[PDB]
Amino acid sequence: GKKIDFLLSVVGFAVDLANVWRFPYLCYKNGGGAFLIPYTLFLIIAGMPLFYMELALGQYNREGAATVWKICPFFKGVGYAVILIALYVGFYYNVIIAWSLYYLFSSFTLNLPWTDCGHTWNSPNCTDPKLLNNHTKYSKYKFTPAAEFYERGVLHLHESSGIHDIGLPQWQLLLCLMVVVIVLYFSLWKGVVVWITATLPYFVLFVLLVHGVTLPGASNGINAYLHIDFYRLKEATVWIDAATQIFFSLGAGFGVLIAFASYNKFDNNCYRDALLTSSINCITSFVSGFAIFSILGYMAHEHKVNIEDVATEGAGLVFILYPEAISTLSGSTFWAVVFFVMLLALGLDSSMGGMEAVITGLADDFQVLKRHRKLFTFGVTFSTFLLALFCITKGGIYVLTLLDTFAAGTSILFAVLMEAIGVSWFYGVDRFSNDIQQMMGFRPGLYWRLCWKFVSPAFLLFVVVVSIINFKPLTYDDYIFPPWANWVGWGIALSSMVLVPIYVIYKFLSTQGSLWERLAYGITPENEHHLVAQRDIRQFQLQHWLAI
Numbered sequence: 001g002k003k004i005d006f007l008l009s010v011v012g013f014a015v016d017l018a019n020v021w022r023f024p025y026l027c028y029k030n031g032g033g034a035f036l037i038p039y040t041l042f043l044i045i046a047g048m049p050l051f052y053m054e055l056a057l058g059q060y061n062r063e064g065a066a067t068v069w070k071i072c073p074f075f076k077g078v079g080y081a082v083i084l085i086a087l088y089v090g091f092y093y094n095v096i097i098a099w100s101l102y103y104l105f106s107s108f109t110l111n112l113p114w115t116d117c118g119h120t121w122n123s124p125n126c127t128d129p130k131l132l133n134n135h136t137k138y139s140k141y142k143f144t145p146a147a148e149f150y151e152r153g154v155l156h157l158h159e160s161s162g163i164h165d166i167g168l169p170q171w172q173l174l175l176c177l178m179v180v181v182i183v184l185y186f187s188l189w190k191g192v193v194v195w196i197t198a199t200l201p202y203f204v205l206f207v208l209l210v211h212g213v214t215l216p217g218a219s220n221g222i223n224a225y226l227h228i229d230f231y232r233l234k235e236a237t238v239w240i241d242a243a244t245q246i247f248f249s250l251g252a253g254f255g256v257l258i259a260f261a262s263y264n265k266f267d268n269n270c271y272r273d274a275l276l277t278s279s280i281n282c283i284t285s286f287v288s289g290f291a292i293f294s295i296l297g298y299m300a301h302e303h304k305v306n307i308e309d310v311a312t313e314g315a316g317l318v319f320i321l322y323p324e325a326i327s328t329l330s331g332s333t334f335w336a337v338v339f340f341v342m343l344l345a346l347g348l349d350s351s352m353g354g355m356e357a358v359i360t361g362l363a364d365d366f367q368v369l370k371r372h373r374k375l376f377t378f379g380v381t382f383s384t385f386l387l388a389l390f391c392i393t394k395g396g397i398y399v400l401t402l403l404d405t406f407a408a409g410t411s412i413l414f415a416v417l418m419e420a421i422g423v424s425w426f427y428g429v430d431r432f433s434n435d436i437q438q439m440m441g442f443r444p445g446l447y448w449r450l451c452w453k454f455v456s457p458a459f460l461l462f463v464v465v466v467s468i469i470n471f472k473p474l475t476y477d478d479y480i481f482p483p484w485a486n487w488v489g490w491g492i493a494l495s496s497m498v499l500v501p502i503y504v505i506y507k508f509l510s511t512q513g514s515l516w517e518r519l520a521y522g523i524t525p526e527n528e529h530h531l532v533a534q535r536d537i538r539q540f541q542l543q544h545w546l547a548i
């Protein structure tokens, strides 16, 4: 009875829109398996400890992303940075849900629009494998009925020459975005059915696996998935992608975990939560990759194209793959409806989590907003609506790619690294362990403390540095962005990165007293500031810095 509720809760917590939409094309962009090795390694080493850290911080301090830094006042800039990262992601995260709503609306028919050519949106080059009996060597084969539908009857991308000619918003995606935004606002306006939003993703995935294994070309897709290329592992692109996707799927670095845990019971078991979430995430990622590559092998067989060229490597890979596998099921209309309802539910839940992450973080800092949740929610929602309108234009896919590349890459990694440093070195891993013992009754093991203090920061710093010194100019399949687009993306990435040093400078300059007094007040918890006048600061001793 109640244990069923516990199950539903944990499984729903372990699923995300990321695992269903983003992981497929990141695994396919790399070799598959070659992406799972770095994925699992980083998952354990950095993701599990930092997920546990964020949950414990939120639970113990009962604060959001920003105000939780009363323990170490100099990192409120890190809190602000994660809130800004969360605000940036929503702009394009809400457009991926409008796509799901459009596909659901298009799915209410006995002849799915992506099954064959002959529609108003099909180009003369549309090739239906059933209606007819090569393809360069390194193009992405955009002439299939499903790709044609996605890019011309939904995106209308054929009316944009690049990110310099995005055009005007598409009026159908406009209505879908309006509906999504209204639903979010009315689901968030009055405070902080989910049963069927945690079981459906696994039923869909199970059906996908079982059915796609038994397809004419799935064997070669599985063989490609299970073949590992280490010369790919020697490039750091896979490592950067794996780290970013880990922090996307687990929800760390967005302020969502801290805000959600601020409402948890003080005695809730965070260690069990972290273990279960990480295990489910790993298993789900592996199964999702398996099914995705089985479908990719099927399409490679059907279209007589190389597996590396069958589908796009960016956002929309799912909107091509999943319709193409649904069209081969019996009663495909029912399956399309079910699948796109599943996508809508998952996306709405993820957007609600992120928007709540932002609203709670900003309301804890300013009480006026906390007293006017309706108006503040409306403001956040309307800003998101406009900055997402930017992404539903004819060239909106280019803007979405730029955002999905730059709004949480080196920025989210840097923010999580700063969180770990502030919690482990300046606040004290020993103090954090004592707090965890006070909450849950047992102290964290040596592995957790080592990961929090040395291992996870080291790997995070390595990946952050490598993502900067080894930066590949942005591209969308065969399209190469103009040089200024990369500068715009890097400015977007820095807009949140610079909030940490800027706030450190501001806090230092605001505090009164001599240099040492200002430093002590900036590194001491606000509830122990009376000790500063007594010249009793742990951080000014070697024992604090040599503590694990």
Ligand SMILES: [Cl-]
Pocket (backbone or CB within 6 Å): 018, 019, 023, 245, 249, 285
């Ligand atoms: Cl994932």
